[PDB]
Design a protein around this ligand. Structure first.
Ligand code: IA2
Ligand code: MG
Length: 776
């Protein structure tokens, strides 16, 4: 058995190595230690010290330098006996404090053990290197097992969610949190792989094609939705909720993807060191010379949208190679050969639109002297060059019921051109998801397991509207964890009259959430929207109004003294300064009508569908104004959060080791901040101090059959039939508790103590067969 075979890859890559005789001598020692700060200023840098003596209220130890210090037993972060070092579930630690938790993760990390349980949820520290722990062999390991039977792994928590989906007939969800680069996407891929395995149909015609397409749906989304940012080479620039559908029996019947917040502005601009979306680079370097000449494509350096960051390649990634994988993925999912060609003739078109150079004419209006880029764009898009030109520089609008042609200056024509580009890309991205959904969505499933893979918390030198929406979302997800771990848990105990004194874990980011999406009084997004439909509003009137409402009034808001165009929001993961530039236009997300008219007449099927299809080219309208981006998003997110509330949540906390994307470099300061703001320790405390399991009094006749005074499934008094199979083995009485309608178990009695009554190999058929047929 791989599990019990100390030579298996499983025991080599998922278990803690056997300590040697020298480590044993240290393990059996009587000496005690404490975690302390050598430099009181650097509170996250710890060293180990031996406790040499104690008072009734203090400990005295010895600093690595031989120095001696005294601390109060209450302010002491004691070090757990080393037999705990590497423990797979930290809720089992004797001492639960920051240095102790970080240490255990470190010990496991140093051995390439990136997974560790922290009570009910899983913690994943990004290794930044490959570890052979995701093979089909590994999958077949964890298929069918108890979480406490196998080692910590993303597969394990995946199986658990899967078993719970069946045993309870309830929909589940895998919520994977983490700042940018932490490992959310990578783990998301494993959840799907595992589920498409243990639940897929026998790999065959359709029987193994559905789950094959499900897996190929993501490589597509990645080429168009991911890009290199300063924090992650493969950063997801869009959020994703993936539903894995199962039939009544329990088999995969399909899936659907719901995307959120594509960072459209990236197509036309990238900070020094960033890249545009991967797809642009894969095309230029992976297309045939004929395709290259058919789309008038050159090198990345010959396009404004690709030669501004100073970076066109990623260390260890062959864009030419990835292009093959994307195409190959499009084939499998079901994209026609024409569609694909269209898909690249919009991508190629976008690059050309970027090269259009507008210039100041004789007046203030713009003019296009060199039309090489313009004609090339029109060419591949299949639209009239003359019409697009006029639409770009001279769009028509209404003025008091009068059609008057505009003549935009250089700056404005440039923006309109960018506006067109972003609309094309965003719509194209939406189309792909739609196309992909139709292929995977073809069955009325009953249960589903939702996998959430959002853009993680991020901070850059310059943070704009996009970052606010991203961080607001991560703030909601964190509060979703706070809710289901501390609030809902304690309201249960409350109504359950189990005798619990309320605990305040100090984890609540509702103030910050309100400050952003509040309506009454109005939060940032509200004020933003208000300004967006104000005729005379400007980025200046917006920042001023925001300061007016929150400066020195909201505790999570800050009007900086060093700038007049930024405001700081204090998030769970830290304070972020936001630059207000362009927020109004970004919120309104305008696009000249002429531009759309121009493209509605494209000779290309994909292009026309992006401009004629209501569910893609249309915008929900609020009265005389279109719905803003802030409002649309808030709406979308609230919906998602509404869906998760109807599922049984399984949490996975991804942790980034450092900020350099380097392996074997676990920085304590970087890791502890995350452990604190994620509420990892409070989540462990709530489990050790509480009662997770809670069966109803009625259905309490489940695994409890005659293991006491004879009492089968039946009893006519429930409160009574309950303390009945328990007292036999005289289980500790304050190791559980009785509630108004349920029975709670501390630190999991069902597993800790109940190991004889259940999980036995005796008590079913051996306690009753001694005199089977032979009695005289
Ligand atoms: O990107 C857009 C711009 Cl600029 C304007 C309008 Cl009126 C609609 C969109 C739009 N609609 C839909 Cl539906 C998607 Cl998806 C996108 Cl993107
Ligand atoms: Mg990601």
């Amino acid at each position: 058995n791989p599990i019990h075979d100390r030579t298996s890859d499983y025991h080599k890559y998922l278990k803690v190595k056997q300590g040697d005789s020298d480590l044993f001598k240290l393990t059996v020692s009587d000496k005690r230690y404490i975690w302390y700060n050598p430099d009181p200023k650097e509170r996250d840098s710890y060293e180990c010290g031996e406790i040499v003596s104690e008072t009734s209220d203090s400990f005295t130890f010895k600093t690595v330098d031989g120095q001696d210090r005294q601390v109060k037993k209450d302010d002491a972060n004691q070090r757990n006996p080393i037999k705990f070092d590497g423990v797979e579930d930290m809720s089992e630690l004797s001492y639960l404090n920051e240095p102790a938790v970080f240490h255990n993760l470190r010990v496991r990390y140093n051995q390439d053990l990136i997974y560790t349980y922290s009570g009910l949820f899983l913690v994943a520290v990004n290794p930044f290197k490959r570890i052979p722990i995701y093979t089909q062999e590994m999958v077949d390991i964890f298929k069918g097992r108890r979480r406490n039977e196998v080692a910590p792994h993303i597969f394990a928590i995946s199986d658990v969610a899967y078993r719970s989906m069946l045993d309870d007939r309830q929909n589940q969800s895998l919520l994977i949190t983490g700042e940018s680069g932490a490992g959310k996407t990578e783990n998301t891929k494993k959840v799907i792989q595992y589920l498409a395995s243990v639940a897929g149909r026998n790999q065959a015609n359709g029987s193994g094609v559905l789950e094959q397409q499900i897996l190929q749906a993501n490589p597509i989304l990645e080429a168009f939705g991911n890009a290199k940012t300063t924090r992650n080479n493969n950063s997801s620039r869009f959020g994703k909720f993936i539903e894995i559908q199962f039939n009544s029996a329990g088999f995969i019947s399909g899936a659907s993807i719901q995307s959120y917040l594509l960072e459209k502005s990236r197509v036309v601009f990238q900070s020094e060191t960033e890249r545009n979306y991967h797809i642009f680079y894969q095309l230029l370097a992976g297309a045939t010379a004929e395709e290259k000449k058919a789309l008038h494509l050159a090198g990345p350096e010959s396009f404004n949208y690709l030669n501004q960051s100073g970076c066109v390649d990623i260390k260890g990634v062959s864009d030419s190679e990835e292009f093959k994988i994307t195409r190959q993925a499009m084939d499998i999912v079901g994209f026609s050969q024409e569609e694909q060609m269209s898909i690249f003739k919009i991508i190629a078109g976008i690059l050309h639109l970027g090269n259009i150079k507008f210039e100041k004419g004789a007046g203030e209006g713009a003019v296009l002297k060199d039309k090489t880029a313009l004609n090339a764009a029109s060419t591949v898009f299949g639209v009239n060059p003359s019409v697009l030109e006029k639409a770009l520089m001279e769009p028509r609008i209404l003025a008091g019921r009068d059609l008057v042609a505009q003549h935009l200056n250089v700056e404005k024509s440039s923006s309109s051109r960018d506006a067109l580009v972003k609309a094309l890309y965003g719509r194209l991205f939406l189309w792909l998801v739609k196309k992909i959904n139709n292929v995977l969505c073809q069955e009325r499933k009953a249960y589903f397991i939702g996998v959430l893979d959002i853009s993680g918390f991020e901070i850059f030198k310059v943070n704009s509207f996009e970052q606010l929406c991203i961080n607001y979302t991560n703030e909601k997800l964190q509060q979703f964890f706070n809710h289901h771990m501390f609030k809902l848990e304690q309201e249960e105990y409350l109504k359950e009259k189990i005798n619990w004194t309320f605990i305040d874990f100090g984890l609540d980011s509702q103030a910050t959430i309100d400050l952003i999406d509040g309506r009454q009084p109005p939060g940032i997004l509200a004020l933003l929207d208000e300004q967006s439909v104000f005729p005379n509003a400007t980025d200046n009137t917006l920042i001023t109004k925001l300061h007016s409402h929150f400066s020195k009034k909201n505790a999570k808001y800050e009007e900086p003294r060093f700038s007049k165009t930024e405001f700081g929001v204090t998030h769970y993961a830290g304070q972020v300064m936001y630059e207000i530039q362009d927020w109004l236009e970004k919120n309104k997300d305008p696009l000249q009508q002429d531009l759309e008219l121009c493209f509605k007449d494209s000779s290309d099927n994909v292009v026309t569908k992006l401009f004629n299809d209501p569910n893609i080219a249309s915008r929900a309208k609020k009265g005389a104004n279109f719905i803003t981006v802030a409002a649309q998003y808030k709406e979308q997110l609230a919906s998602l959060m509404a869906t998760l509330e109807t599922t049984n949540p399984h949490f996975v906390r991804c942790i980034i080791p450092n900020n350099k994307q380097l392996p074997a470099k676990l920085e304590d300061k970087v890791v502890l901040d995350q452990l604190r703001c994620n509420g990892v320790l409070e989540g462990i405390r709530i489990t050790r101090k509480g009662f997770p399991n809670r069966i109803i009094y009625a259905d309490f006749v489940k695994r409890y059959y005659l293991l006491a005074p004879n009492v089968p499934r039946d009893a006519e008094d429930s409160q009574k039939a309950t303390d009945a199979v328990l007292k036999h083995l005289n289980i500790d009485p304050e190791q559980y508790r009785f509630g108004i309608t349920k029975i709670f178990f501390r630190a999991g009695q069902l597993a800790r103590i109940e190991e004889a009554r259940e999980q036995r190999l005796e008590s079913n058929e051996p306690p009753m067969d001694f005199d089977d047929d032979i009695p005289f």
